[PDB]
Amino acid sequence: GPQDNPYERGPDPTEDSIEAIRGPFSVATERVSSFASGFGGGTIYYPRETDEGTFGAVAVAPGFTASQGSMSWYGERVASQGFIVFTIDTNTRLDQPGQRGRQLLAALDYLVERSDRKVRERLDPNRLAVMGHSMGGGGSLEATVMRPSLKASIPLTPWNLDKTWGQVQVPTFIIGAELDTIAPVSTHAKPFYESLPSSLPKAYMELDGATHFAPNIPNTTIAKYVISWLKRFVDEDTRYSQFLCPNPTDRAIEEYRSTCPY
Numbered sequence: 351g352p353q354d355n356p357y358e359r360g361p362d363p364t365e366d367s368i369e370a371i372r373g374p375f376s377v378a379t380e381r382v383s384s385f386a387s388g389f390g391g392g393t394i395y396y397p398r399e400t401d402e403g404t405f406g407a408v409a410v411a412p413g414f415t416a417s418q419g420s421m422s423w424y425g426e427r428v429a430s431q432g433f434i435v436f437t438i439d440t441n442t443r444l445d446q447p448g449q450r451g452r453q454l455l456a457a458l459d460y461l462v463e464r465s466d467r468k469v470r471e472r473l474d475p476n477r478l479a480v481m482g483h484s485m486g487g488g489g490s491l492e493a494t495v496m497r498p499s500l501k502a503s504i505p506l507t508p509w510n511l512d513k514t515w516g517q518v519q520v521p522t523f524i525i526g527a528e529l530d531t532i533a534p535v536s537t538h539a540k541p542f543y544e545s546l547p548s549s550l551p552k553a554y555m556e557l558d559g560a561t562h563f564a565p566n567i568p569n570t571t572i573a574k575y576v577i578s579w580l581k582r583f584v585d586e587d588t589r590y591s592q593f594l595c596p597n598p599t600d601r602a603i604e605e606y607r608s609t610c611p612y
């Protein structure tokens with residue numbers, strides 16, 4: 351409960367509450383121009399209620415050739431659980447993973463320093479996270495090397511030719527798609543997971559039969575554990591450890607790996 355952690359938001363969770371398409375907070379939006387420095391604009395989703403305190407934030411990058419619309423459903427789904435969610439566009443649709451990581455950080459720096467005051471008054475600027483799809487997921491890994499003070503990283507069906515992530519010390523949850531032919535889990539997602547420190551709080555979830563664009567379509571299996579990961583590590587909320595440890599056994603999951611307990 352709140353006596354043990356000033357960052358806990360929302361009622362005590364259940365499997366139903368993390369599977370729900372909306373959490374307990376209502377959500378408002380705010381668009382950001384592509385002339386924002388260091389990235390290509392995007393959309394900020396944020397909780398409306400301020401009665402429980404300020405919130406952490408996650409920047410969300412799209413993949414190669416893609417734009418923020420490929421990631422829009424995370425906005426209200428995750429922000430309603432008590433997060434500021436920033437779906438961003440890249441400088442160009444052909445930007446590479448390192449560039450996407452710089453742009454995730456530029457977008458977080460926008461929230462902390464330049465965002466509308468309705469957003470800033472609800473933001474804990476010290477509790478920030480990254481998430482992204484395909485090359486944006488490669489950028490998620492990149493961003494945590496660039497900024498080790500981030501609190502969580504969620505690479506979704508990630509793409510990156512750089513396979514070695516032993517320097518990463520931000521808790522990282524990689525989601526792979528079993529049938530991914532664009533970023534095969536055997537050469538992208540799983541080598542990334544295996545190269546993260548064995549001492550790091552980390553997880554890998556492989557979605558049975560799923561393809562590369564599974565993260566661009568509302569997916570309860572993705573959503574429930576993205577929410578649980580962000581709760582546990584951006585809010586330090588150990589009420590969500592119950593869903594992450596022991597490993598999820600959802601029928602939709604082909605394989606799950608972790609450094610549980612955490």
Ligand SMILES: [Ca+2]
Binds near residue numbers: 384386387388389390
């Ligand atoms: Ca710009």
Ligand SMILES: [Zn+2]
Binds near residue numbers: 351
């Ligand atoms: Zn508590």
Ligand SMILES: [Zn+2]
Binds near residue numbers: 401402
């Ligand atoms: Zn309330």
Ligand SMILES: [Zn+2]
Binds near residue numbers: 426
């Ligand atoms: Zn909406």
Ligand SMILES: [Zn+2]
Binds near residue numbers: 447448
């Ligand atoms: Zn790179």
Ligand SMILES: [Zn+2]
Binds near residue numbers: 512514
């Ligand atoms: Zn590297």
Ligand SMILES: [Zn+2]
Binds near residue numbers: 605
């Ligand atoms: Zn597999």
Ligand SMILES: [Zn+2]
Binds near residue numbers: 528558559604
């Ligand atoms: Zn399968």
